[PDB]
Structures are given as structure tokens and as C-alpha cells.
Write an enzyme that holds these catalytic residues in place. Sequence first.
Site: not given
Ligand SMILES: CC(C)S[C@@H]1O[C@H](CO)[C@H](O)[C@H](O)[C@H]1O
Length: 986
Positions: A59, A104-105, A162-163, A223, A261, A327
Amino acid sequence: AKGPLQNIVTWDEHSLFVHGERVVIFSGEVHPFRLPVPSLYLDVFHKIKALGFNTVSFYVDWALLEGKPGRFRADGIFSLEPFFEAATKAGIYLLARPGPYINAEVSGGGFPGWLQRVKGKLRTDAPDYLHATDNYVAHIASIIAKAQITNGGPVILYQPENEYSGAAEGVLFPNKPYMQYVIDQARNAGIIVPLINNDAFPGGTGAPGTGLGSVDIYGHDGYPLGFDCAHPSAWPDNGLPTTWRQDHLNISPSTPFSLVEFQGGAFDPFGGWGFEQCSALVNHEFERVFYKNNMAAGVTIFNIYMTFGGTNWGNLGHPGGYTSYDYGASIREDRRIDREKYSELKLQGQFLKVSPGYITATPENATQGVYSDSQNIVITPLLAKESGDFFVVRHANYSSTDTASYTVKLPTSAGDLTIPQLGGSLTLTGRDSKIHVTDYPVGKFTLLYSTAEIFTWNEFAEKTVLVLYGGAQELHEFAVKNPFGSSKTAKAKKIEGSNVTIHTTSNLTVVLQWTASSARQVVQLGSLVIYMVDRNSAYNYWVPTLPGSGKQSAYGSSLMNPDSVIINGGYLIRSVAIKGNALSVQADFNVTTPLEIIGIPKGISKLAVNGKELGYSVSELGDWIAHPAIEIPHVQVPELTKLKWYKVDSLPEIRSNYDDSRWPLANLRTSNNTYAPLKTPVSLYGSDYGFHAGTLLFRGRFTARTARQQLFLSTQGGSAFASSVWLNDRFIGSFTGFDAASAANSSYTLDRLVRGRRYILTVVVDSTGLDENWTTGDDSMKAPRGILDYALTSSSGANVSISWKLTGNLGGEDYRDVFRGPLNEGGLFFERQGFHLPSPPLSDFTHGPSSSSSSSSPLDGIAHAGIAFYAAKLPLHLPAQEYDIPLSFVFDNATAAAPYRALLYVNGFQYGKYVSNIGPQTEFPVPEGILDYNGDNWIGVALWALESRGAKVPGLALKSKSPILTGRERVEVVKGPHFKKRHGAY
Ligand SMILES: CC(C)S[C@@H]1O[C@H](CO)[C@H](O)[C@H](O)[C@H]1O
Ligand SMILES: *[C@@H]1O[C@H](CO)[C@@H](O[C@@H]2O[C@H](CO)[C@@H](O[C@@H]3O[C@H](CO[C@H]4O[C@H](CO)[C@@H](O)[C@H](O[C@H]5O[C@H](CO)[C@@H](O)[C@H](O)[C@@H]5O)[C@@H]4O)[C@@H](O)[C@H](O[C@H]4O[C@H](CO)[C@@H](O)[C@H](O)[C@@H]4O[C@H]4O[C@H](CO)[C@@H](O)[C@H](O)[C@@H]4O[C@H]4O[C@H](CO)[C@@H](O)[C@H](O[C@H]5O[C@H](CO)[C@@H](O)[C@H](O)[C@H]5O)[C@@H]4O)[C@@H]3O)[C@H](O)[C@H]2NC(C)=O)[C@H](O)[C@H]1NC(C)=O
Ligand SMILES: *[C@@H]1O[C@H](CO)[C@@H](O[C@@H]2O[C@H](CO)[C@@H](O[C@@H]3O[C@H](CO[C@H]4O[C@H](CO)[C@@H](O)[C@H](O[C@H]5O[C@H](CO)[C@@H](O)[C@H](O)[C@@H]5O[C@H]5O[C@H](CO)[C@@H](O)[C@H](O)[C@@H]5O)[C@@H]4O)[C@@H](O)[C@H](O[C@H]4O[C@H](CO)[C@@H](O)[C@H](O)[C@@H]4O)[C@@H]3O)[C@H](O)[C@H]2NC(C)=O)[C@H](O)[C@H]1NC(C)=O
Ligand SMILES: *[C@@H]1O[C@H](CO)[C@@H](O[C@@H]2O[C@H](CO)[C@@H](O)[C@H](O)[C@H]2NC(C)=O)[C@H](O)[C@H]1NC(C)=O
Ligand SMILES: *[C@@H]1O[C@H](CO)[C@@H](O)[C@H](O)[C@H]1NC(C)=O
Ligand SMILES: *[C@@H]1O[C@H](CO)[C@@H](O)[C@H](O)[C@H]1NC(C)=O
């Protein structure tokens, strides 16, 4: 979107191609802004390259580079140039993800705070939002365009937005004119590599074939264990994805199956479980089950979010996390690679990069009782006519911790075979998954089948080498098609071990069975040598690549099956090079070990490790065994309790003599904030005045109408914020905070007032950052910081007026420290004056002896509600040229103590927000480079006592980890500006 715009990076149904070579892209996420030491980017890239990865995804944070609207700045620690130079020196390619929105938190999800003054909805085609992004994208997409592979640099792919995956009710979605405007801004700045996106689930948004707004390659995320690390041994029923091969065929069959991701750990909130617990949930068993499940669907662009996380220094994080961004990732926040998940991920990366047949095999539906008599396992096949098949084996209940015994019945060029052919049973132990192969090519040799997993193989001057592994006590079998060529004389030769058995058939297929253990077996068949080890021994093997020539030398001979040397032993191997008749190795050692080198190039006769020549023994196979000197010393560091501490009051506002005539007036009668319409006569939101970072203060003047009055005050700071209130110098009360509160309604009595006299309320409101904006059409990033509503009433019910002043960081959008950036400082008095910087003005501080009445140490603290700042010189003299020694600052959390909040400063950089009644963080790492290991350093601690009794730090210590003998490139100290007196400060 209608095809590629250049011929260097291209794609089809199966894979990307780079310079005309098919490749499996195996990538790790790293964020340059979370590691502000340019000379350590090469250390992290050496560690990702040694996993067998070829790519890093990154990023860029807009909020750090345009903190004043219309002034883009990316210099010094904010430059991308040393990140791009280090990728080329390590031989790594890059996926660039610059937003403008990144999530990106991080604070605002990347959006600078001045977007709260933009009326229309964020991430839509409202014209005020679109035109607010134009300057940033023009500058950042032009920097990344110069670093493209088409101009000799490392950039191969670009992600816009993004997303972008859904929206609020009654908001147009997908908004296709909005998607196309974002793509046009990148093309117009010179970006010509392919565009890829990252949908939250397989929803099909922006895929090829959808018209206006579509990208070149459709990508999605996964995730499957979610983000709550409360129960690290629990895997949910139905938690494993089983439909992604079919969903890929339904949505975008024309482009490579891409996971942009996929889960490599989890984020953790204030009041959470800690990243040690997150690393136990997303562990080596998670990797082998879930990652081999993505291989069973034929993934060929695969990025692990996060691989190295780094730290949220300088307030750059959002309220939903705290200072650390470890993380639970494979590489820790301090850059150590000791976790077992790092060694398991290396096994997968080195297997894929020697296995080109994987890319072109076709994945099929999962089966049960088809490729095995047993129904207690599930097997997913990847099939091809002649180039080799793969089979991914798992337990039928994917979560099972039981051991299963089984056999397999697999298709081969010699027909269908039940394996093991020489008798016995295979074993699948708890939370494991295996890839078995048929017709697998090993240079000029062929493996008819193998049950054991492949680590690596290569062809060398005098032999071909293959390395196979199994978990301890597992029986394995493999078969090699006739390895003896013409000779009806030649025969197998057992070189090492007493467990392996060898049987030859009449057509000279050689069948070998072995039981894996600590004791390596080695067998020679003609010029093929096979090394058979257990999983735990395979964890200490490394496969560095031999350099080519010119600017691109570190990329080696090719991306798949590159020229290499195989090394058995060592905590890390970074690189190899040939110079005349010598092989030179750069390596790191955390424990004593010999090194064995396998595959010596022709004509080489001398060995050096880290610049030093050493002797070696030669085995009958021509491997070299060497014994480098490895001394792991006892390290002593200075005791922090014994430094000479100095102190300054950091709440002079509550003293009767305080002059606020330089403070900004809060006199705006209207606001452009459409998400939170005004409830007050004037705006009290920090961002309406240019203040977007760290702690805010407000000062409200009123004339008393009755001796007792009642105050209602509604404050907002983000999750785990706090607020404190004084009436002149008298403490009134604090909202002390909790993980679940982002706002608070408080009610206070203001008593004993003199009628007709003027009083001043001082209100301190912490912010833990600006919220994200992950649902388009709900403007959640615009939630303001400061005072949302108030009422002051007389004892007869009349309303009483208040007039206001406010401050955050000195200068707001005209911020004072251009070297350390727009977010580093908040608004507390010690920050506004620059007293956190190196070499502060000690005549403005106090010094006194510890454990006395006049102590100037944070271990003694303060005896009333309030805020103090402490500074000290810390000399270091450590052997940094020869050793990597990770250092951290540790707060003691002593069960019975009054609540406080602290800020940690090192050489002017904020490196910690500590919250004693919320947690979970007590240990704060700071990198070499921010720290000077052979010179003086300045350390800083702010202490905010929330209750009337005051507070102190119960204990504070510097801690080291076990030292690592190192062959890294030298770390240069980051030279930030020292204190200088600031004109116009208050
Ligand atoms: C739940 C995801 C599909 S969105 C994904 O989540 C991550 C969590 O650490 C980050 O926030 C990423 O920037 C976001 O694209
Ligand atoms: C130093 O050492 C001291 C100990 O001496 C430490 O102090 C202790 O610290 C802990 C942790 O901060 C405190 O425990 C929490 O207390 C919270 C406040 O509780 C008070 O207010 C409540 C709300 O009004 C009230 O209900 C409470 O009443 C109950 O408890 C009291 C007992 O005091 C009792 O009298 C009542 O009868 C009643 O039982 C109380 O008055 C509280 O909110 C916390 O609750 C969470 O944890 C417990 C489980 O452990 C749960 O049962 C709750 O449901 C709640 O769960 C959330 O949080 C966890 C952990 O992260 C998570 O697993 C859950 O799923 C759930 O998550 C969601 O909510 C949270 C917000 O609460 C969000 O952050 C999440 O957000 C993100 O995460 C998601 C993924 O998980 C992600 O998907 C989302 O996108 C994202 O937003 C979720 O929304 C705790 O109870 C102790 O009070 C305190 N003890 C003492 C003695 O002081 C100190 O921490 C140490 N310091 C250091 C530096 O280490
Ligand atoms: C120098 O740098 C090196 C790296 O280069 C560091 O070495 C690493 O150190 C870490 C920290 O100790 C090690 O991780 C921890 O490992 C332990 C021990 O278990 C491992 O080793 C033994 C061999 O001694 C194996 O038998 C283990 O594998 C079995 O157990 C696991 C379950 O843990 C299972 O998944 C395997 O498939 C296997 O099961 C089979 O055998 C068992 C017999 O028990 C049998 O019951 C079963 O049916 C099967 O037959 C394993 O490989 C492990 O306990 C720890 O895990 C726990 O904690 C983590 C959280 O921290 C959780 O994720 C986990 O769920 C557990 O609760 C850790 O994994 C690491 O292995 C090691 N690496 C290497 C290469 O040596 C040094 O530490 C550094 N030194 C210094 C000074 O810096
Ligand atoms: C699949 O296997 C898992 C793990 O062995 C089972 O999880 C166990 O479930 C029981 C009862 O629900 C618990 O007592 C154990 O504590 C669980 N173990 C773990 C490690 O979490 C799970 O029930 C099985 N699921 C199905 C559908 O068979
Ligand atoms: C609101 O919007 C316009 C944008 O042009 C700006 O000129 C004005 O100063 C802003 N007002 C406030 C109160 O922020
Ligand atoms: C505070 O009170 C107002 C009513 O004045 C209410 O609208 C709001 O939800 C409350 N906020 C919190 C955090 O309780």
C-alpha cells in the site's frame, strides 16, 4: 478493458507470463510506511526471497504524503526510491496498491482528515470527492510509472481502489462511471502494466465482460477464520472454502485464478488477545491445510496479507487497532524468522518454483472414496495428459486432529496403481495435508510417483540432486523410471542410512521405501542422488540463486527452476556469489551449526562465509562440510532506572497565569460535515479547523449566572479514547474509557461559583485516529473528533452561553516537522514546543533525585490528575557491525494501580501509545536505525494521570533478544532534526 498495453507482462486462463516465461506469482504483503528505516528494506526482502517468493505487494498511505491540501511531499523517510532500489538488489518484483482508499487498519483508511470538510459522499462520483483525489493520484501514479518493469524497474501489476464490493441501501452499486474515473486517473499518469482488483468475496464486481469500469484480471480475497483470536485451537464447521474453482469458472474463466489477499494472521483491537495468540490461531497447521486447499483450486497469483507487518508509529493507525502491527505474521515486527510458520511457508515456496507442471494441470471437483478405498479422507485431483498430475489429500472433516491410515489408487503413465506397491500403509496425522505426484519431471529423470513431498531439485556439473521429506515415523514410497540408461551392469548404491529398501523390477523401474526420522537416508542411482529427510530437518535447508549480470543480476537465470546452490544448515542464507575460484556466502546464525554445501560449481576450490576464508572436509559425493566460527555473546544493556531523567509540566493551561491569546478561535457557525450535522451554535470538530492527529484541547469561557450550574458534555475520540475536564485549576472528572466506547455522555456539577465572574473550562479529548469507510454510501470516516453537544444551565433552568477556543498539533495543516511527517505530533504542550526532539532545552526542565519529594523520574510520577513529560540521554555501544540485536521498551502492569495513558518517544519519533486500564500491549519494539547503537539517543515518556490521586509507571526496562551473528548490509542511522526554538509557539 481490452487486452494488454505492452508485451513484458501478459496472461491467459492459466497464469501470468513475465518476459515470455510462465510463472506462479507467490507474493508477501509489506507496507513501506510502517518501517521508516530505508537501509532495512533489503533485510526484509532477503528474508522473503529465501521463502522462495518472487513478489512483494504494498500500500501507499495518502494521509502521510498530502497532509496539507494541494502540497504533495514524498521525501526522506517518505520516499519510495530506496524501497524500489532494494527490490531490484534482492531480485523481487512488486504489486503496487496506492488507493486512493486503502482501508489497511490505518487512520481514515488512508483518507486525509481534511476530507471531513468535503460535502458529497466518499467513494462515489460526487464531484467535490473526485476532484479532491486528482493531485495525489497524478503525483503517486507518476512515481510508480517510472519504476515499471517496462522502464527497467521492479513494478509488474497495479491495483486501483480497494475491496469495492457493496454499498448502503438506496446507493447505486456497482457505480460504473465512478469505477472508470478511478482507472482513467491511473492510465492518464502513465501506468501501462495490467490492472487487478480485490473483491471481498466472489461477487463478480469489475470483472472482464462487465463493460464500463472493468479491470484486466479479476481478483478476490479470503479470511476464513475471521479476526477474533479468542479460541486459537477452534476451527469452525464449514469453515473451509470448497466452491472457489467453480465460482472462478462462473465469473472470469479467461484470466488466472487470483487471491490478491489471503489470511497470513489477524488484526487485534484495544482490549484484544495479543499477537502471540493470533500467531497460534494462524499457525503452521493453518498454513499446510488452508494453503494447500488453494493449490487444490489451481491458484497462480497468491499474496499473503501480512508477511511482515511492522509498526503503527506516529499515530498513523485507526481506533480499531493499537501501536503494534505484528499481525501474528511469519516475519515478526522485529524482523526475526524463528516462528515455525516461517519454516513451513519456505517448504511450500521452494516446492512451487521447481514445479512448472502445476500451472498447466486442470483442477477438478473434490472426491471421497474414488482415489482411495478409505472414506475418512478427501482428495482433489489436478490432471493433465502427459506433463504430470498432483493430488491434494486432507481429512474428510477438515478440522480433525485424529491420525488416519490409508492407501491411494492413482493414474500413471504405467496405468492405475495402488500405492505402496511394496506393502504397508501411509499415515495422515492431525491437521495435516499432503500433495502426492505422478509423472513428475526431475531434470532428465522421471518420478513415476512419490508419496513423500518435494522440497527442491536441480541439475549440477557432476550429478542431479532431489530432496524429499515426510513427517517423523511416516512410511513413504517413490519410484524412478530406469535411471541407468544403457548399462545393464549399473546398480543402486546406498550411501547413508540403514532403513531404506530398494527393489528393482525387470524393466528397471527402481522402487524405494523408507520411514522418515532424524537420520538422513541417501541413495545414488547412476548420476541421480536422492536425499530423504524428515520435515524438521527440511526446515534448515536453503536454496539461494546464483546471480546473472547487469542491472537485473539478482533475478538470476530465470524465475522458475533457476541456477542455484543447496545449503543444509543456518538460521538464514541471504545470498551466494562466485569470485574467481571462490564461492562467497552471506549468512546469519542464531545457534552453532555446521554448514553442508551441495552442488559446487565447476572449477571452484575455496570457500568464504561473511568475508572470511575457511577450510572444509569433502564427502564421497563431492559435498563440502565446513565449521564457521559462531560465538553467541552475553549482551549487557544500560538499566533505564539509572539514567539521568528530566521533567516538564505538560498541562500549563490550568494555571491562573496562562495566556491563550495565540490560540485559534472556534467561531465557525456552519460546518460542511454532512454525516454529523451541528447540534451546537459553533463547530467543535477538530478537522473543521485543520487538526487531524493525536490529542485535542478546548477552552470554553462563560459568565456565572447562579452559584451552582449543571454541565452536560458529549465527547467523541474513537474506540478506547478518554477525556478529562478542569474548571480553572480545579479537577472536575474524567471519562476513563473502555474498548467498546468511541463516544461518551457526561454530566457534571459546577459548584461554588461567584455570580458575574468569568470562568474557563479546559477539556482534553484523546483521539486514537479517524475511522475507516469500508461501506460505500455510509460516510463513517467523517465521524468527528472533539465535542458533539453540550448544555450549561443555571439552578433556575436558564441557558448560559459558552464561547470557545481550540488546538491540535501546532500549525494544523501547516505542520512544523516536515522530516517526520503530518501525523507524528498531537496537540499536548510538550509536543507543540518541540520538547520531544533530540537535544531538548534542559534549562526549561527540572531535575531532582529519585524516590524523593522532588523526583524528576517517571517511576515516581505525579500525585494529582494532570499531564507531565520526561526526557533522558541513553548512550549505546553495541557490536552492530557483527550482530543483529533486537531491542524493546517494557512497561510493568501491576494489578492494583490507578489508570493512566503514556506516549513513548525515541529520537523525536512517537513509538507507542500505552493505555494501562485497556491494554493489551506492554512491550514496544524500536528498530536499529531509529536507535543509534554506537552514539547518544534521546528517550521520551509522556504520563497522563486520569484520576484525582495521580499515577506513576510501576517499572520500565530495555530488553534484548538472543543476538544473531549477521551477514546483512550495514544499517545507517536516520538523521532527524534536533530541537530548535519554534517562533509563534503556544
Ligand atoms: C475482510 C477483507 C476482505 S477487506 C481487507 O481486510 C484486511 C484486514 O486486515 C485489510 O483491512 C485490507 O486493507 C482489506 O482490503
Ligand atoms: C493491566 O491489567 C488489567 C487487569 O488488572 C487489565 O484490565 C482489564 O482489561 C480488560 C480488557 O480491556 C477489561 O475487560 C473488558 O471490559 C470492557 C468494559 O466492561 C464494562 O463496560 C461494559 C459495556 O457497557 C459492561 O458490559 C461491563 O459489564 C460486565 O462486566 C462487569 C465486570 O467488570 C460486570 O460487573 C457486569 O455484570 C458485566 O458482566 C463492564 O462494566 C468490556 O467491553 C470487554 O468486553 C469484551 O470482552 C468480554 C470477553 O472477554 C466479552 O464477554 C464481551 O462480550 C466483549 O467482547 C468483545 O471483545 C472481545 C475481545 O476483543 C472479542 O473477543 C468479542 O468478540 C467482542 O468483540 C466486539 O466488541 C469489541 C468491543 O468490546 C470490539 O473491539 C470488537 O471490534 C473488532 O474486533 C472484531 C473481531 O473480534 C472485528 O471483527 C471488528 O471489525 C472489530 O471492530 C467487536 O465488536 C471486557 O470485559 C477489564 O475490565 C479490565 N479489568 C480490570 C480489573 O480493570 C488491563 O487491560 C491491563 N493493561 C495492559 C496494558 O495490558
Ligand atoms: C533459532 O532459530 C530457530 C529457527 O531457525 C528457532 O527454532 C524454532 O523454535 C520455535 C520455538 O520453539 C519452534 O516452534 C515450536 O515448536 C514446538 C516443538 O514442536 C516442534 O518440534 C518437534 C521436534 O522436536 C516436532 O515433533 C513437532 O511436530 C509435531 O507436533 C506438532 C503440534 O505441535 C504437529 O503439528 C506436527 O505435525 C507433529 O505431530 C506429530 O508428532 C507428534 C508428537 O508430539 C504426534 O503427537 C502427532 O500425532 C504427529 O505424529 C513440532 O515440529 C511446538 O510445541 C510449538 O507449538 C506450540 O506453540 C505454537 C504457538 O507458539 C502453536 O502454534 C502450536 O499450536 C503449539 O501450541 C512451536 O511450534 C520451531 O519448531 C523451531 N524451528 C526449527 C527449524 O527448529 C530457534 O528457536 C531459535 N533460537 C534462538 C535462541 O533464537
Ligand atoms: C471435526 O473435528 C474436530 C476436531 O477434532 C471436532 O472438534 C471437536 O469437537 C468436540 C465436540 O464438538 C469438542 O469436544 C472438541 O473440543 C473439539 N476439538 C477441537 C480441537 O476444537 C469437530 O467436532 C468435528 N466436526 C464434525 C462436524 O465432525
Ligand atoms: C465548505 O465548502 C467550500 C468548498 O468550496 C469552502 O469554500 C468552505 O470554506 C467550506 N466551509 C466550511 C465551514 O468548511
Ligand atoms: C448521548 O445522548 C444523546 C441524547 O442527547 C444521544 O442521542 C446519544 O446517543 C448519546 N451518546 C452516547 C454515547 O450515549
